[PDB]
Amino acid sequence: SLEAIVQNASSDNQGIQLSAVQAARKLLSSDRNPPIDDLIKSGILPILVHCLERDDNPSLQFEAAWALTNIASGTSEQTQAVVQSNAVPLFLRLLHSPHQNVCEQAVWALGNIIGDGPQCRDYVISLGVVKPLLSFISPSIPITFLRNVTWVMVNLCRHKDPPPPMETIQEILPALCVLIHHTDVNILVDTVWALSYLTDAGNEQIQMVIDSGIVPHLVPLLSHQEVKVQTAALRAVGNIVTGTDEQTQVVLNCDALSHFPALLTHPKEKINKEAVWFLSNITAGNQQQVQAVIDANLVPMIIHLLDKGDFGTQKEAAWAISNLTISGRKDQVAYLIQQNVIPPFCNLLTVKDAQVVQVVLDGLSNILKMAEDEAETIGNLIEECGGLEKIEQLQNHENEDIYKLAYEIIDQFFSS
Amino acid sequence: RKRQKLMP
């Protein structure tokens, strides 16, 4: 029974105690549906926490840390039960053990605890987990231990409400700079997911990432053979290019667009979608960045995805086309007109999603305004593909801005 | 986010 297990776990006979702790561990580590609540209610937590102190018996420490790791792998309530037992300070002490397995199990437990939430993460941070954790990174470390370390780093970087403290980001970025040159796929995926979480927390963290000097080694991963590495790298660089024009220009100066012909033609629709999202954030920039997209010969593929892509990729493609008008010259919009953007761009006006219809109407109106000399021919083009009927039906729409823009467009460029 | 250590 569990009662006997706890009582024996409190025994002064080392054999009885170790056997009890091992029985608990086995109860918590044999199946994917362990009995965590039963063990918590039994009162075993403080006993395991005490066992964490037994530096004389590395096996007892390892077994107790294993049990606590598996209790902390459940719901937030069970992880917080482990936290309330004062386990985190003793795990942080164990991080300095001379025994590799004990260190690794402490890292594992701390990773499960940090991943619960940002306040738990910040409690573990305030106690100084980051320096010991990152001190494990080395060539001599076993690859599985290093993967656990990188998983803990990822958990440290997730949650952006609040985001990790600035000092912690400054400590973690050099470790990521080191790890982004690793060959193991799992370490690369963890490193790049950590970078994606860090770059999704505002422009200041993006500038920190840029200053670390890691982007030149992040952009090449867009062409990695493993699709997980590609997805993570694309997320990270997309986040970066959601920033200012200068950060986007850093990304571009890393030769990023050269990687996108393979991303736009990728068989995975989600990769096409993320790539078109990146490109839409590129087209929302200055004239030279729009011209870089044009020179990379990516516009035809963007229009093809607008025409024949899944709805998400079509959303991002519509956003890219409409962003090009923000700062694009009339020459650069004429290039779009020559590439037959009007028909597939207008075919989106019937989608139920109101945001897409609004974006497409905005883009059409801006296109008609820019090309004053060719306004009539572009209106004829819009009418040949059945876009005029769509725009006129949109006069009966629910949203206010939608029918407002519809009436404005019809009056200005379809009456005259 | 969370990992259970299953006896390998």
CA gap A115, A193 in Å, rounded:
14
Phi and psi torsions of A226, nearest 5° = -80, 125
* Residue A350, number of CB atoms within 10 A of its CB: 13
Q: Indicate the resolution in Å.
A: 2.2
Structure tokens at A411: 């009056």
- Report the half-sphere exposure of A76 (CA within 13 A, side-chain side): 7
- Residue A261 burial class via C-beta count within 10 angstroms: exposed 0-12, middle 13-18, buried 19 and up: middle
Cis peptide before A162 (omega within 30 of 0): yes
CA gap A332, A350 in Å, rounded:
27
Structure tokens at A258: 């050269």
For B5, the closest of A79, A108, A158 (CB atoms) is: A108
Give the single-character DSSP code of B3. -
Q: CB B5 to CB A66 under 8 A?
A: yes
Three-class SS of residue B5? coil
Structure tokens at A116: 């619960």
**A-B C-beta contacts closer than 8 Å:** 36
3-state SS of chain A?
CHHHHHHHHCCCCHHHHHHHHHHHHHHHHCCCCCCHHHHHHCCCHHHHHHHCCCCCCHHHHHHHHHHHHHHCCCCHHHHHHHHHCCHHHHHHHHCCCCCHHHHHHHHHHHHHHHCCCHHHHHHHHHCCCHHHHHHCCCCCCCHHHHHHHHHHHHHHHCCCCCCCCHHHHHHHHHHHHHHCCCCCHHHHHHHHHHHHHHHCCCHHHHHHHHHCCCHHHHHHHHHCCCHHHHHHHHHHHHHHHCCCHHHHHHHHHCCCHHHHHHHHCCCCHHHHHHHHHHHHHHHCCCHHHHHHHHHCCCHHHHHHHHHHCCHHHHHHHHHHHHHHHHHCCHHHHHHHHHCCCHHHHHHHHHCCCHHHHHHHHHHHHHHHHHCCCCHHHHHHHHHHCCHHHHHHHHHHCCCHHHHHHHHHHHHHHCCC
Give the single-character DSSP code of B4. -
Question: What are the Cα distances from residue A229, in Å, to A30, A41, A86, A187, A297?
Answer: 32, 42, 37, 10, 25
Q: Are A78 and A40 in contact (CB under 8 A)?
A: yes
Residue whose tokens read 């200012």: A244
A238 closest CA partner among A204, A276, A194 = A276
Q: Are A17 and A9 in contact (CB under 8 A)?
A: yes
Supply angle C-alpha A154, A156, A160, rounded to 5.
100
A24 closest CA partner among A412, A15, A244, A8 = A8
* Residue A267, number of CB atoms within 10 A of its CB: 7
Q: CB A158 to CB B1 under 8 A?
A: yes
A chain contacts of residue B7, beta-carbon cutoff 8 Å: 26, 29-30
**Experimental technique used?**
X-ray
For A115, the closest of B2, B5, B6 (CB atoms) is: B2
Question: What are the Cα distances from residue A379, in Å, to A155, A364, B1?
Answer: 53, 10, 53
CA gap A114, A172 in Å, rounded:
15
- Residue A409 burial class via C-beta count within 10 angstroms: exposed 0-12, middle 13-18, buried 19 and up: buried
CA gap A325, A359 in Å, rounded:
11
Q: Which amino acid is at A116?
A: D
CA gap A347, A328 in Å, rounded:
23
A chain contacts of residue B3, beta-carbon cutoff 8 Å: 73, 108, 111-112, 151
B chain contacts of residue A111, beta-carbon cutoff 8 Å: 3
Q: What is the domain-level CATH number for residue A226? A: 1.25.10.10
User: How many independent structural domains does chain A possess?
Assistant: 1
Give the single-character DSSP code of B6. -
Q: For residues A365-378, b (16+ Cβ closer than 10 Å) or e, as one string?
A: bbbbebbeebbeeb
* Residue A384, number of CB atoms within 10 A of its CB: 12
Q: Are A358 and A313 in contact (CB under 8 A)?
A: no
Supply angle C-alpha A370, A383, A406, rounded to 5.
65
Long-range contacts of the stretch A368-374 (C-beta < 8 A, 24+): A368/A409, A368/A412, A368/A413, A370/A325, A370/A330, A370/A333, A371/A330, A371/A333, A371/A334, A371/A337, A374/A334, A374/A337
For B2, the closest of A30, A73, A105 (CB atoms) is: A73
Phi and psi torsions of B4, nearest 5° = -90, 135
B chain contacts of residue A115, beta-carbon cutoff 8 Å: 1-2
Contact of B8 with chain A, judged by CB distance below 8 Å, is answered with no
CA gap A70, A395 in Å, rounded:
59
* Residue A286, number of CB atoms within 10 A of its CB: 15
- Residues 6 or more apart whose CB falls under 8 angstroms from that of A257 comprise A282, A292, A293, A296, A298
B chain contacts of residue A116, beta-carbon cutoff 8 Å: 1-2
CA gap A359, A316 in Å, rounded:
10
Q: CB B2 to CB A72 under 8 A?
A: yes
Phi and psi torsions of A378, nearest 5° = -70, -35
Domain, as residue range, for A351: 2-414
* Residue A13, number of CB atoms within 10 A of its CB: 9
